[PDB]
Design a protein around this ligand. Structure first.
Ligand SMILES: C[S@@+](CC[C@H](N)C(=O)[O-])C[C@H]1O[C@@H](n2cnc3c(N)ncnc32)[C@H](O)[C@@H]1O
Ligand SMILES: [Hg+2]
Length: 258
């Protein structure tokens, strides 16, 4: 049935079996503050939820699937027919010459979705000027539009209760009440040593932990994914730390034992 409409860095599809076995048995509303591709969100298909991400282009994708599914599919079908390296390169440069400012939100959504489907590794990346800088891919699937899926996600969103937010995670959890369930999947701590990053800092990791604690002290179930780093071990030392994969690939923290 439902699943992510796009590939995304840190996507949790493969981890679903483990997560499904650790989610609380009963809860109220659902929250996913670093939504990304939404693997869990779409797997749960909550009737009342709250999703958020700092990346504005990604959220626009969610908003347009909800609001203009038909037009989105039409445009995607056009990109599909004219697909070529040359085509890709000219559409990509739109964010370097003000054309991007003249494009509608739905047109912008179609542009990014198309690019991710045909570029190198389906990677989302921009340069210091916020311009997309990923090259064209090789031997990719010529089928890049999934019509029924988009239509389905749209129907679902429009028939339920969903709050779509853009901005910092902290702002997206203000309405948390006792019994709600929140799943956090922030950018992982790199494997003390200072580190370069895309945006989330260790200082932020601290802030996040503080927020985790606050929510726990209020009566909500919280889940958090991160790397198997010692810092992670020290940080949530007061909680139920789960280890995943022998060589231990990653960690999942909970404020409970169901
Ligand atoms: C690790 S990925 C989420 C992956 C998602 N679990 C999956 O299933 O597709 C982390 C997300 O955090 C978002 N993010 C980064 N900094 C943030 C911040 N300060 N507040 C909220 N979201 C943030 C990133 O844009 C990225 O989408
Ligand atoms: Hg996107």
């Amino acid at each position: 049935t439902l699943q992510p409409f796009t590939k995304w860095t840190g996507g949790k599809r493969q981890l679903l079996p483990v997560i499904r076995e650790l989610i609380p048995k009963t809860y109220n509303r659902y929250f996913e503050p670093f939504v990304g591709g939404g693997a869990l969100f779409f797997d749960l298909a909550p009737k009342d939820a709250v999703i958020n991400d700092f990346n504005a282009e990604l959220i626009n994708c969610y908003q347009q699937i909800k609001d203009n599914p038909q037009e989105l599919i039409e445009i995607l079908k056009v990109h599909q027919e004219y697909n070529s390296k040359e085509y890709y390169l000219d559409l990509r440069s739109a964010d370097r010459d003000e054309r991007i400012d003249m494009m509608s939100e739905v047109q912008r959504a179609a542009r990014i979705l198309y690019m991710l489907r045909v570029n190198f590794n389906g990677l989302y990346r921009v340069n210091s000027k916020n311009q997309f800088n990923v090259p064209y891919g090789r031997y990719k699937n010529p089928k890049i539009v999934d019509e029924e899926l988009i239509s389905a996600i749209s129907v679902y969103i429009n028939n339920n209760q969903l709050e779509i937010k853009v901005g910092d995670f902290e702002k997206a959890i203000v309405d948390v009440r006792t019994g709600d369930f929140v799943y956090f999947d922030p950018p992982y701590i790199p494997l003390f040593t200072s580190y370069t990053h895309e945006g989330f800092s260790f200082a932020d990791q601290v802030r996040l932990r503080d927020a985790f604690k606050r929510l726990s002290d209020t009566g909500a179930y919280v889940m958090l994914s991160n790397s198997s780093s010692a810092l992670v071990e020290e940080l949530y030392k007061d909680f139920n730390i789960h280890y995943v994969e022998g060589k231990i690939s990653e960690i999942i923290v909970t404020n409970y034992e169901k």
